[PDB]
Design an enzyme around this catalytic site. Structure first.
Site, PDB file in Angstrom:
ATOM      1  N   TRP A  74       0.843  -1.187   0.000  1.00  0.00           N
ATOM      2  CA  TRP A  74       0.000   0.000   0.000  1.00  0.00           C
ATOM      3  C   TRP A  74       0.881   1.240   0.000  1.00  0.00           C
ATOM      4  O   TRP A  74       1.757   1.384   0.859  1.00  0.00           O
ATOM      5  CB  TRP A  74      -0.936  -0.006   1.209  1.00  0.00           C
ATOM      6  CG  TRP A  74      -1.866  -1.175   1.194  1.00  0.00           C
ATOM      7  CD1 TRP A  74      -1.547  -2.479   1.438  1.00  0.00           C
ATOM      8  CD2 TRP A  74      -3.266  -1.152   0.897  1.00  0.00           C
ATOM      9  NE1 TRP A  74      -2.663  -3.270   1.319  1.00  0.00           N
ATOM     10  CE2 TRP A  74      -3.732  -2.479   0.989  1.00  0.00           C
ATOM     11  CE3 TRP A  74      -4.172  -0.140   0.571  1.00  0.00           C
ATOM     12  CZ2 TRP A  74      -5.065  -2.819   0.764  1.00  0.00           C
ATOM     13  CZ3 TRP A  74      -5.495  -0.479   0.348  1.00  0.00           C
ATOM     14  CH2 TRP A  74      -5.928  -1.807   0.445  1.00  0.00           C
ATOM     15  N   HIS A 131       1.542   5.302   0.194  1.00  0.00           N
ATOM     16  CA  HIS A 131       1.009   6.507   0.812  1.00  0.00           C
ATOM     17  C   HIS A 131       2.158   7.441   1.163  1.00  0.00           C
ATOM     18  O   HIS A 131       3.317   7.027   1.247  1.00  0.00           O
ATOM     19  CB  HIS A 131       0.171   6.186   2.059  1.00  0.00           C
ATOM     20  CG  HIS A 131       0.880   5.343   3.077  1.00  0.00           C
ATOM     21  ND1 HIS A 131       0.927   5.680   4.413  1.00  0.00           N
ATOM     22  CD2 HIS A 131       1.547   4.171   2.961  1.00  0.00           C
ATOM     23  CE1 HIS A 131       1.604   4.757   5.074  1.00  0.00           C
ATOM     24  NE2 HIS A 131       1.991   3.831   4.216  1.00  0.00           N
TER      25      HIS A 131
END
Lengths: 331, 8
Positions: A272, A274
């Protein structure tokens, strides 16, 4: 001295990124370097590498929202959102548990509601729904065929999503995607699109007319997923942060994590992407850094957020911002 | 507006 947001400069298409590796499940690199990696493995349009444009670099520089903004081509709306919530555990722990040493009943209820969510099953639900949507659009060359294919498999699968309204965020998700209508993107052809997933962490107590308890400790009834479908109504999310409990305590309002469309069956092995904050190397917060975390590192979250939503949107198949495989670090 | 950029 200015902590103003600056746009990272343009990186030549041949410039390779500096090497970096994950440590205990998470890798990070300065945003200038991640642009180099993005241009090498994520920038392809029909298999042709591209330089990250001035506009994309501007979007990216806004922080955690920048990665999702760039990869999806749109500022995240969070219209179609899913989550998993154990209603039985929440009701039982309320009527059987007791506040711990140093907790208001509004703080105890807020925490129990927080710990009743299951981010693995929530991401798993968004996975299976996105797979149904991709199968529906595979050979559908107009939206009508896509909706017919989508409803057919939901009904045969006995999915409660079949009964969603024709204008609900679920059924309108494809037609409301800007790149779906663009002549260089989907061109009103669902077969040229693909469903992708990102996640949003946020705070539950966002009603400014509610009690201070819910603003400081959370609203248990807020942002719960509907039964059967798992849909979360994100209409009342207004990017409002958790209110401080003591003076000086600062909270971040949200966090966005880009998953894409990785094929890895292990949720725990999915990566993920970010960022920590907006880009300000000449200012207080410093330069923006892009983080690449395993799912459990991302889903661990922070005390700033008691809610997690897994969102589905669409991008054209010609892009490469959601490849089958995502590798932490470089090379 | 509400500031984004993750400044607390």
């Amino acid at each position: 001295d200015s902590d103003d947001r600056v746009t990272p400069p343009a990186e030549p298409l041949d410039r390779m990124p500096d090497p970096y590796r994950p440590s205990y499940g998470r890798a990070e690199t300065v945003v200038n370097n991640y642009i180099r990696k993005w241009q090498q493995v994520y920038s392809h349009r029909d298999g042709r590498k591209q330089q990250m444009t001035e506009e994309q670099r501007e979007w990216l520089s806004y922080g955690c929202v920048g990665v999702t903004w760039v990869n999806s081509g749109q500022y995240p709306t969070n219209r179609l959102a899913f989550a998993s919530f154990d209603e039985d555990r929440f009701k039982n722990e309320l009527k059987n548990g007791r506040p711990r040493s140093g907790e208001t009943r509004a703080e105890f209820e807020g925490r129990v509601a927080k710990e009743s969510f299951d981010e693995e099953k929530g991401f798993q639900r968004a996975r299976e729904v996105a797979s149904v949507m991709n199968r529906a659009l595979e050979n559908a060359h107009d939206e009508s065929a896509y909706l017919d294919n989508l409803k057919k498999e939901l009904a045969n699968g006995n999915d409660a999503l079949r009964n969603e309204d024709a204008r609900s965020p679920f059924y309108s998700a494809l037609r409301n995607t800007p790149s779906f209508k663009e002549r260089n993107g989907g061109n009103h052809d669902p077969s040229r699109m693909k469903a992708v997933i990102y996640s949003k962490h946020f705070w539950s107590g966002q009603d400014r007319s509610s009690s201070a308890d819910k603003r400081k400790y959370g609203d248990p009834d807020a942002f719960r997923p509907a039964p059967g479908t798992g849909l979360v109504d994100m209409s009342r999310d207004r990017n409002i942060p958790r209110s401080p409990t003591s003076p000086g305590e600062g909270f971040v309002n949200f966090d966005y994590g880009w998953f894409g469309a990785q094929t890895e069956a292990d949720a725990d092995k999915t990566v993920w992407t970010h960022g920590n904050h907006y880009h300000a190397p000449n200012g207080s917060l410093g330069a923006m850094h892009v983080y690449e975390s395993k799912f459990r590192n991302w889903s661990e979250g922070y005390s700033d957020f008691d809610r997690g939503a897994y969102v589905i949107t669409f991008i054209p198949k010609s892009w490469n911002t959601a490849p089958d495989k995502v590798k932490q670090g470089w090379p | 507006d509400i500031p984004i950029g993750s400044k607390m």
